[PDB]
Amino acid sequence: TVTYTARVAKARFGGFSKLLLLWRGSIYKLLWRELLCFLGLFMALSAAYRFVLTEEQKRYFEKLVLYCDRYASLIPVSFVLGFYVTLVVHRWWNQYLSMPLTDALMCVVVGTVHGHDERGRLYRRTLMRYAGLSGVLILRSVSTAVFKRFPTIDHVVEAGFMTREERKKFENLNSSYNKYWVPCVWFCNLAAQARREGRIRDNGAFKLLLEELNVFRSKCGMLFHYDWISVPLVYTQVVTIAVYSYFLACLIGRQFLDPAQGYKDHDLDLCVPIFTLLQFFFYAGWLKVAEQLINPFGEDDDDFETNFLIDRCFQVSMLAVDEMYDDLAMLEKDLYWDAAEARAPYTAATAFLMQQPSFQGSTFD
């Protein structure tokens, strides 16, 4: 993920123009190889028209250039690109929200599974580790970044996500399908055991764990839906054909013709097609937005940081259910306990800006 949120906090004079100076996660990185190949074909096709062609063939070349320039219909592609890109951005934001996060699970686990003894801590840690084990097992199937970190199940055991004994019970399961769902069934059996043993003091507390685990498992099942069912291949090929056929019309249709011929609209030579190379940055770059977001789980710079999230989830969920289990500060009276209004102060950079009138509704003038 390339975060530039702090760069556009204000809307100043260099608002969005300053981000064109950025290289990491940018369009120039994604386009410069196709950009030199587009210009290299243009300069070769121009240099042929200046030296190697004859006077008969040049007049034939001139009529071909005016033919292709008519079929450079840039208007239509700007709809197929926009609808398709919006479809790709919609699946990409929804792939991010289906990332297996255990924050909802850990707040239930610390509040409902009980016990300061060695069995109380083991119930809670194993419950959070089973959630995180499924999260590794769904991310190693959809993320090549996660998969290069856990290429085998032995790596998952080495990482401590699975124990050697659990792997014996894992690999002796007879199923030909992906078994990321297996620690979720292990989760429901550990929660059913602790309810029977009274570590879960309540039946409603037990229902909450199974409610929030299925939310977790449906997020893992949603990442399998996106990985299996991509944007349909025909709609990807239809969008790519229209963009690349528009730049075949520009490769011929924008060639600089001989001024001594007196052609309409064709009498000026820039020797470099500046506005065609800028239109190339537009349309090939607009399509490269979809090529970058269609598989957001790789190793490139703007991709999701799945491995960092896995570390953040295992660290926080152990910390919350072991070190933070029933470790509260003593109940003290707050600083506005005996106050009419509870009003926290402002700093000197925020006092002189926030004397504004409080909104009460639009009918109170």
CB neighbour list of residue 326: distance below 8 Å, 6 or more residues apart: 116
202 is in an annotated binding site: no
Taking the C-alpha atoms of residue 159 and residue 149, their distance in angstroms, rounded to an integer, is 10
Burial class (CB in 10 A: 0-12, 13-18, 19+), 331: exposed
Decide: is 40 part of the binding site for its own copies (CB under 8 A): no
Among 38, 134, 135, 242, the residue binding its own copies under the rule CB under 8 A is 242
Shortest CB 260 distance to its own copies, Å: 14
Q: Which of 180, 217, 226 is nearest to 87 (CA)?
A: 226
227 is in an annotated binding site: no
Q: Interface with its own copies by CB under 8 A: which range of 27-35, 38-46, 51-59?
A: 27-35
Q: Which of 337, 338, 356 is nearest to 346 (CA)?
A: 356
User: Which two structure tokens, joined as six digits, stand for 82?
Assistant: 């926009």
Shortest CB 186 distance to its own copies, Å: 6
User: Which two structure tokens, joined as six digits, stand for 285?
Assistant: 């770059």
Shortest CB 22 distance to its own copies, Å: 7
Shortest CB 56 distance to its own copies, Å: 15
Q: Interface with its own copies by CB under 8 A: which range of 41-49, 51-59, 205-213?
A: 205-213
Extended strands (E) in 168-310: none
Residues 255-274 that bind its own copies (CB under 8 A): 265, 267-268, 270
Residues contacting its own copies: total by CB under 8 A: 214
Taking the C-alpha atoms of residue 258 and residue 255, their distance in angstroms, rounded to an integer, is 10
Among 46, 98, 112, 134, the residue binding its own copies under the rule CB under 8 A is 112
Taking the C-alpha atoms of residue 61 and residue 44, their distance in angstroms, rounded to an integer, is 14
Tokens 């100043």 found at: 12
Among 48, 49, 160, 260, the residue binding its own copies under the rule CB under 8 A is 160
44 is in an annotated binding site: no
End-to-end CA distance of the chain: 46
Decide: is 310 part of the binding site for its own copies (CB under 8 A): yes
Tokens 């401590």 found at: 160
Decide: is 48 part of the binding site for its own copies (CB under 8 A): no
| CB neighbours of residue 42 within 10 Å | 22
Task: Please identify, using beta-carbon distances, which residue of 42 and 110 lies nearer to its own copies.
Answer: 110
Taking the C-alpha atoms of residue 346 and residue 351, their distance in angstroms, rounded to an integer, is 5
Decide: is 39 part of the binding site for its own copies (CB under 8 A): no
Decide: is 54 part of the binding site for its own copies (CB under 8 A): no
Decide: is 355 part of the binding site for its own copies (CB under 8 A): no
Decide: is 305 part of the binding site for its own copies (CB under 8 A): yes
Among 47, 82, 154, 272, the residue binding its own copies under the rule CB under 8 A is 82
117 is in an annotated binding site: no
Taking the C-alpha atoms of residue 47 and residue 44, their distance in angstroms, rounded to an integer, is 5
- Where is the binding site, in residues? 9, 292, 295, 300, 303
Residues belonging to the binding site for Ca(2+) are 9, 292, 295, 300, 303
